[PDB]
Design an enzyme around this catalytic site. Structure first.
Site, short mmCIF file in Angstrom:
data_model
loop_
_atom_site.label_atom_id
_atom_site.label_comp_id
_atom_site.label_asym_id
_atom_site.label_seq_id
_atom_site.Cartn_x
_atom_site.Cartn_y
_atom_site.Cartn_z
N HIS A 29 5.63 -5.01 1.06
CA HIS A 29 4.77 -5.51 -0.03
C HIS A 29 4.84 -7.02 -0.05
CE1 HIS A 29 5.98 -1.56 -2.02
NE2 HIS A 29 6.94 -1.80 -1.14
N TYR A 30 4.03 -7.63 -0.91
CA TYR A 30 4.10 -9.07 -1.16
C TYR A 30 4.16 -9.13 -2.69
CZ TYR A 30 -1.21 -8.99 -1.52
OH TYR A 30 -2.51 -8.67 -1.83
N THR A 31 4.90 -10.10 -3.21
CA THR A 31 5.11 -10.26 -4.64
C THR A 31 3.95 -10.90 -5.38
OG1 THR A 31 6.14 -12.40 -4.26
CG2 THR A 31 7.58 -10.47 -4.30
N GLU A 98 10.00 -6.22 -0.69
CA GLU A 98 9.06 -7.20 -1.25
C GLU A 98 9.19 -8.55 -0.53
OE1 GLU A 98 6.76 -7.30 -3.56
OE2 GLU A 98 6.94 -5.34 -4.54
N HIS A 145 1.88 -1.23 1.76
CA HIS A 145 1.71 -0.54 0.49
C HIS A 145 0.26 -0.03 0.39
CE1 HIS A 145 2.31 -0.62 -4.18
NE2 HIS A 145 2.15 0.59 -3.69
N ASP A 155 -1.59 -5.33 -0.17
CA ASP A 155 -0.37 -5.83 0.44
C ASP A 155 0.25 -4.98 1.55
OD1 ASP A 155 2.20 -4.67 -1.59
OD2 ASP A 155 0.10 -4.40 -2.15
#
Ligand SMILES: [Zn+2]
Ligand SMILES: [Zn+2]
Lengths: 254, 254
Positions: A29-31, A98, A145, A155
């Site tokens: 994922h990316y935050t 993440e 995700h 993401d």
């Protein structure tokens, strides 16, 4: 030996052959936020992840520092409503990593994504390999995700280096020769039967419902393209997209 | 502190709040075989379980000996195709406890079940409590293999003491007053709307498909009755069966 317990004892001398890990998937994922804000969020009573890699990890003894917020034995809330290769509730059988990254921002209408700092990627690779090796996660089970929740997430996005990681033994990736073969002599952008592609995607693991709107169908195709065909992810079915799915299904099955 | 790894280090000082166990369900089965045969089976490359309790457990230091074939951290192959409260692949999130017991045998047409030796039950209770407490498993999530696979299994069967265990804090069980209340002044065997019952059962966790044959519908109702209405489990919907479902849903929700 024999373990003593309260009111009984356990004989563990006999071990069964059918004993496998409960963990089978690795989600990236990316935050879409800065480190401190991401950390505060991923540690509050609503969402979380097993790991949080900063954009440029602080080095210590020549090694980048990655934060671990949840023990791998426990599940974290990072996948949400999800589905992959026939499973739902991916939080149950996966590990979530993440990556600090802004994600996308609509600049002049053109929804632009933020590139991933090479440092972050370099720190991720080692981590991903330990996890994968520690539970014998299969390449096709290292996902985005967006792959497990096509209708809701993008993401890690089109700028995330999936091919680079694959060549490092992380994640599934087709074979050049095979992708061409399946193209069957057609222009990479040659329109293809939408439904025929969706079938291949559902077989690869994407959640395809038997009654989706054109919008939802584009989402599935799009998420697939942001992963394996980042050069163009309009959610339109074409030769190359289908040629890639066929090579993936041929090399990883279902 | 800070864990050192190959190519990176992990900072585990910050712990997330959303961190829960991957294990949420406890499934009870019967081997339908003798100990040695069950042990050989549950330890071969096809099926297995986390625990195997003998009909009359061998006592050591005043405590019965229970075999453990698979670490609780790993999944065992005991549930097979299954579904419960919205989840499938229950092997992923559950622990399986095999009880040595003959199961059922059709003697004179009348499919008779084998009672459970009190010794075995007494050894199970302690075990079940450690597991339940160790992952905060909810009462409604301590199930019968038949409950998660109504169309294929009967185990542990109608003779298994679910009420006895409930009074011990193991498993879900309605409340007398509540069950009567919901009966709404009707004979326990008063015929009820099949579909209305199936709805309650699906809401409680039973896998009810929107297109089942009368045979399959009886299976779901039957499995439910072998668990909470053992006095009669013909798979026929009646006041008491429905009154019990309502009290269970009222006390455990979904
Ligand atoms: Zn995400
Ligand atoms: Zn069973």
């Amino acid at each position: 030996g024999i373990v003593e317990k309260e009111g009984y004892q356990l004989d563990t001398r006999r071990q069964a052959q059918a004993a496998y890990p409960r963990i089978k998937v690795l989600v990236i994922h990316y935050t879409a936020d800065d480190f401190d804000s991401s950390l505060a969020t991923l540690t509050d009573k609503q969402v979380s992840s097993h790991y949080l890699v900063p954009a440029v990890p602080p080095r210590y003894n020549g090694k980048p520092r990655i934060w671990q917020l949840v023990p791998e034995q426990e599940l974290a809330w990072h996948a949400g409503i999800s589905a992959w290769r026939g499973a739902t509730r991916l939080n149950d059988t996966s590990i979530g990593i993440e990556l600090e990254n802004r994600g996308w921002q609509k600049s002049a209408g053109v929804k632009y994504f933020a590139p991933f700092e090479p440092a972050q990627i370099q720190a991720l690779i080692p981590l991903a390999k330990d996890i994968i090796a520690r539970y014998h996660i299969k390449p096709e089970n290292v996902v985005a995700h967006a792959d497990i929740a096509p209708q809701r997430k993008d993401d890690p996005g089109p700028l995330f280096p999936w091919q680079q990681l694959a060549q490092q033994g992380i994640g599934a990736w087709p074979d050049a020769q095979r992708v061409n073969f399946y193209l069957a002599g057609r222009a990479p952008h040659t329109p293809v039967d939408t439904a025929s592609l969706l079938e291949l995607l559902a077989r690869y693991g994407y959640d395809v419902k038997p009654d989706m709107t054109p919008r939802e169908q584009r989402r599935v195709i799009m998420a697939f393209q942001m992963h394996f065909r980042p050069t163009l992810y309009n959610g339109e079915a074409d030769a190359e997209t289908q040629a890639i799915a066929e090579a993936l299904l041929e090399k990883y099955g279902q």
